[PDB]
Amino acid sequence: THLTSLDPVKQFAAWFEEAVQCPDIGEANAMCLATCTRDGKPSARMLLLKGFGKDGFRFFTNFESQKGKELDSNPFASLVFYWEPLNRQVRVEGPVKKLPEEEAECYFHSRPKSSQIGAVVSHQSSVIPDREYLRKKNEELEQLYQDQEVPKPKSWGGYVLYPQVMEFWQGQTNRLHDRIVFRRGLGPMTHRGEEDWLYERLAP
Amino acid sequence: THLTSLDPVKQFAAWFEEAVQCPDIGEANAMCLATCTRDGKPSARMLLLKGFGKDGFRFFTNFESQKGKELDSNPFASLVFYWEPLNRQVRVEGPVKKLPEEEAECYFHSRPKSSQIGAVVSHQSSVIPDREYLRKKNEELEQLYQDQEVPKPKSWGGYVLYPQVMEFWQGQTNRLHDRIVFRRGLGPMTHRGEEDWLYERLAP
Ligand SMILES: Cc1cc2nc3c(=O)[nH]c(=O)nc-3n(C[C@H](O)[C@H](O)[C@H](O)COP(=O)(O)O)c2cc1C
Ligand SMILES: Cc1cc2nc3c(=O)[nH]c(=O)nc-3n(C[C@H](O)[C@H](O)[C@H](O)COP(=O)(O)O)c2cc1C
């Protein structure tokens, strides 16, 4: 194996720490979120991990965006972390729950005022006429919210992905990449991890 | 807009060139491929772009892997290119066609012998007992194929994604990210690109 922990959330923590300390990785928490329609049309985009633990992986967005519409209709997702300078990939699959509105509100107000105003101004993924449109509306909302709290948009909040599958991939120069996959659940190549996790090695 | 071309495949080419010339990007052709089951369970993983043009985006894999099973069942995919040092993202969505077997064979034999043997040895995403298993089988196949052509596995080949949607995202320090989305297909904020493409600007 060559693992730090047989709890894959703690293995993730170990790798995440190493990615944060790597000077050649800009945002260690950048990840690709894949969603799809119930009818099976996939979509995917980058966003930032904003909290993780036993309960899973947290991220925030406008619920009226493509990703929010798909998660609300079809609450299953996949994440990919790719840390090229360390030749490492982490894949996560699992169901998603929307975060309580109180938790989203508290998180929203912990962010810089410019980010809060950014969320108000931008109906994420709606059509706009040009660049200047955005700059102008942002400055008008800056005026509106001088010395005042910015309210969280009704359409803004978070989700938590509860992991059911987690794969750790370490690339190798000889092409025989190390892949260790954890799944929640015995064959001779299948092994018991912590809690209800099982793990096995996969061919690259 | 701030674009090089209103054909989004040529816009992609322009950005791809800039990513290749960036010394802080290791593999400019690394991309995240999102697929899903017909029933709407998404999955996603990194792989390499291996050709692109008017017909679309080409990639190669074992058809018996998760991605191959999903594409064969449900031939729709999404790609994400993320070039952190340039603060750029490209998203592509479209249908997939499997490449002709003759084209796959010719491509397979153009690769280094070690890569060809790697494809034979590794039933991608099947379970294996340990690291040494892989090293040993690789060396045995090296013996078998000394001074001899390696046959392409029946289960190995490629796919081409024909783009229907392409988004170009340029991150900005002020958070008002530039997003220009091209779709194949008139509102006042929707514009004609080349061929059957339309484009518009989206809120970040
Ligand atoms: C590094 C990076 C991080 C991002 N983080 C987020 C985020 O944390 N939340 C978010 O809503 N969008 C984020 N985006 C923007 C998304 O790529 C996307 O433009 C947006 O969320 C709309 O996606 P959708 O239309 O597919 O739902 C990020 C983009 C980049 C490049
Ligand atoms: C940078 C990078 C490039 C990769 N390129 C490929 C590839 O080109 N073809 C491929 O089959 N797997 C590639 N992989 C491995 C995939 O991440 C994955 O392990 C494998 O294809 C099996 O995926 P699946 O089980 O989801 O189908 C790559 C991994 C990394 C980190």
Query: What chain B residue is nearest to A191 in terms of C-alpha separation?
Result: B129
Q: Which residue's CA lies nearest to atom 10 of ligand 2?
A: B61
Q: How many beta-carbon pairs under 8 angstroms link A with B? A: 182
Query: What chain B residue is nearest to A87 in terms of C-alpha separation?
Result: B26
Q: Which atom of ligand 1 is nearest to the CA of A48?
A: 8
Check: CB of residue A189 under 8 Å from CB of residue B128.
Answer: yes
Check: CB of residue A178 under 8 Å from CB of residue B101.
Answer: no
Check: CB of residue B28 under 8 Å from CB of residue B18.
Answer: no
What approach was used to elucidate this structure? X-ray
From B100's Cα to the closest Cα of chain A, the distance in A is 24
Buried b (16+ CB within 10 A) or exposed e, A159-178: bbbebbebbbbebeeebbbb
Q: Which atom of ligand 1 is nearest to the CA of A44?
A: 26
Distance CA A156, CA A99 (A): 11
Tokens representing residue B67 in the block = 């991605």
Given CA atoms A45, A17, B125, B99 in this order, what sign does their dihedral have?
A: positive
Which residues lie across from A56 on neighbouring strands? A53
Chain B partners within 8 Å of A126 (Cβ): 202-203
Tokens representing residue B195 in the block = 């061929």
Known catalytic residue at B58: no
Distance CA A25, CA A29 (A): 10
In the block, which residue shows the tokens 């800056």?
A: A142
Distance CA B135, CA A17 (A): 30
Distance CA A68, CA B108 (A): 40
Question: Using a 6 Å cutoff on CB, does residue B43 contact ligand 2?
Answer: yes
Check: CB of residue B181 under 8 Å from CB of residue B199.
Answer: yes
**Rg of chain A in Å (alpha carbons):** 19
Distance CA B88, CA B172 (A): 10
What helix, strand, coil percent values describe chain B, rounded to 5?
30, 35, 35
Active-site hit among B58, B88, B175, B192: B175
Check: CB of residue B183 under 8 Å from CB of residue B198.
Answer: yes
Which residues lie across from A83 on neighbouring strands? A88
Nearest to B178 among A37, A131, A200 (CB): A131
Question: Using a 6 Å cutoff on CB, does residue A83 contact ligand 2?
Answer: no
Distance CA A32, CA A34 (A): 6
Query: What chain B residue is nearest to A24 in terms of C-alpha separation?
Result: B24
Ligand 2 centroid from CA A106, angstroms? 39
Tokens representing residue A75 in the block = 């609450």
A30: Cβ–Cβ under 8 A, 6 or more apart, which residues? A46, A47, A48, A49, A81, B82, B84
Chain B partners within 8 Å of A91 (Cβ): 43-45
In the block, which residue shows the tokens 């928490």?
A: A29
Ligand 1 centroid from CA B63, angstroms? 31
Distance CA B199, CA A136 (A): 22
Resolution in A: 1.7
The number of beta carbons lying within 10 Å of the beta carbon of residue B169 is 22
Distance CA A161, CA A122 (A): 25
Chain A partners within 8 Å of B67 (Cβ): none
Kindly state the helix (H) or strand (E) to which residue B23 belongs, with its residue range. none
The number of beta carbons lying within 10 Å of the beta carbon of residue A92 is 26
CB atoms B203 and A37 under 8 Å = no
Q: Domains in chain B, ordered, with CATH? A: 1-204 (2.30.110.10)
Q: Pick from B144, B100, B98: which is nearest to B121 by CA?
A: B144
Check: CB of residue A197 under 8 Å from CB of residue A9.
Answer: no
Check: CB of residue B26 under 8 Å from CB of residue A84.
Answer: yes
Q: Which ligand sits nearest to residue B48's alpha carbon? A: 2
Q: What are the distances in angstroms from CA A115 to CA A29, A119, B18, B104, B191? A: 17, 6, 29, 48, 30
Q: Pick from A155, A134, A76: which is nearest to B44 by CA?
A: A76
Q: Pick from A72, A69, A71, A85: which is nearest to A27 by CA?
A: A85
